[PDB]
Amino acid sequence: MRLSYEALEWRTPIENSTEPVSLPPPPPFFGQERAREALELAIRGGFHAYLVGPPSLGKHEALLAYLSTQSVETPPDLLYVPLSERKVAVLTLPSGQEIHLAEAVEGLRFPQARAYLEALRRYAETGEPQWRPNLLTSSSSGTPPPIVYEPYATAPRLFGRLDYLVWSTNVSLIRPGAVHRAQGGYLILDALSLKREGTWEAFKRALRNGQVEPVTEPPAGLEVEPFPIQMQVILVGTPEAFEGLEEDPAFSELFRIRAEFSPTLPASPENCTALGGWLLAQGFQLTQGGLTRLYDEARRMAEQRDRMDARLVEIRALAEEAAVLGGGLLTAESVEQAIAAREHRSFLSEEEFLRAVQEGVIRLRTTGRAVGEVNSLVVVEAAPYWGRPARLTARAAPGRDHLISIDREAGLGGQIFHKAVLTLAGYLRSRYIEHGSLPVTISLAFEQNYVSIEGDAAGLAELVAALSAIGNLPLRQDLAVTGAVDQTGKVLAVGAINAKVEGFFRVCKALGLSGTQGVILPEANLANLTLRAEVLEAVRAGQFHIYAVETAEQALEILAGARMEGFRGLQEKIRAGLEAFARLEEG
C-alpha cells in the first residue's frame, strides 16, 4: 500500500500560535499512576521503596515535590549521650525537651534519658578531674517531614564523623550524617552512588541492625551503641542501576516497593495540557504554538504517534534552547529552530558522508534499475543516530544450496544479523523445492561497509536482492528498503524507522530529487512514522513515496514493477532462473 500524505501527517494543528498559554501546574507524578500508587503504599506502610526509570525523567524532582506535601508528627529531639567515657548512645526525647535536659546538666523529669544520668555518677570521691548531651537535630513541625536527599553516599555523609581535638575526642565532637538528619522522615539516595562509594554493605547493616558508626581515623575511639532507626529510605536509579543491587537477596528484603516510571505517556490532550502547566510553573513564557511543537517533538522522541516521551528534563532542556532563540519566548518557531540547530550541531559526520557520495567516493545509486542490488538502510550507533542508505548486492551462481553473507563470514556481522541470514535461507529452501535442494549459491554483500553491523532489518533487502539475482529481475534503485523477514516470508517491524526514511530522503535530496524516490517499509511500523516536516512536504508534493508491505514478495513486486502471478509475472521468472541454474549445475 502507498501511504498518502494524509495517512502520514501526525502533527497537531495549531490555532492561534502566538497566544499566551495560561494553565495550572499538574500534580507530582502526572501520567505516572503506577509509581505514584507504589509510593503512596510505601508512605502508608512505612516501607522502604525504590524509584526506577530511565535518566532525565525528573524522578528526583517529582519525588521531592510529592514528599513536600506530606505530614508527620513533629520529629523527636535527636542526640548522642555518653554512657561512659568511651561509649555513646543515640537518644530521642519528645521535641524541644533537649534544651531543658542540657541546662539541668549545665548545672551539675526525663524518663527517656535514664542511663545517661545513672552513669553520670566520683570526682568528689577521688578529686577525679566530654559529658554534656550532643543535640544532633531538632524541629518545630513534621510538616513537611524531614526530607534529606544525599546524592553522594560516602560513609561520612551517610553516618557522620568523629572530629579530633588535640589527640582526644568525646560525645561533643561527633557530627551527624544524613541518616541522623533523616530520622522521622525520608532519606533519598541514588543506587549508583551506594555502589560506586562502596557503602551498600554498611548501609544494609544500618537498616538491618541499627549499626550507625561515625567515621574515625585509623588513636583510640568511642564505641557507638546500635540504635533503632526511624526513617523511610527511597532509592532512585535506572533499571540497570538496580540490577547490581537486585542480585543481593537483602535488596528485595529491605526494598519491597518498586515505584516504576513509564518512559512514555499516552499522547492525550490531558497530557499536553499537563505539559503546558508544568512548563509554565518552571518559569517559561509559552505560546500555544510553542506548547504544540514541544508536545509533538515528545511524540517524535517516543517514535509513536499515540505516545509521548515522558522525560520532563529532556523536554525542559529543549525548551531552554528554544527560549534563547525566541528572545525569552517559547514559540512554535523557536522550538522548530532549536530542533534544527541540534541537528546542525551534530551534522558534521553526515555532511562528510553526503560529500563522499556526491564525489563518487561512496558509490550509491538513487535512480535507474539494476539486477541483484538494492539500497537498504542503516543507523549509525553514535548520538543522535543518523540513518543512511547502504548498498547491498546479491550474486547468484550455479551451486549447492549456499546462502553466503560476506559481512558475516568476514566477522563484521553480529548474531542477530546472522540469524536473519539463516532465516532467509530457511524461507528460500522451503519455498522453491521442485529441484530438490536449491541449485544456487548466493552471496550477499554490504558494498562499502567497513564496520560491524547488527540487527535483522536488512532481511527484506537481502531477500529481494537474492530473488532478483535468481530471476534476473531488474530492481528500481530509487526505492530504499527496510524490514525484517520471518521464515514464512512475512515482513516484520524494525527500529529507528524515522531516521532510516529521513536518511534516504537526505541522500536523494543531495543527489537531486528525481520525483520517483522513496522507501518500502513494514506495515507493522505505521504507528511509528512520525516523519519530519520536510519529508512530509515532499510526499505531499509527489516528490517522495512511502510504501508499506506485509510480505517480501509485495516488496519485490514494487521493486521489479510487476506482479508475482498474472504469469508473465515474477514467480515464473524466478522458477525459470532456478531451472537454468539447475541445468548448469547438473547436465
Binding site: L377, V378, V379, V380, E381, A382, A390, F417, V451, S452
Partner: peptide, 5 residues
C-alpha cells in the same frame, strides 16, 4: 561507529 540495521 558500528551500525544497526
Amino acid at each position: 561507529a558500528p551500525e544497526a540495521v
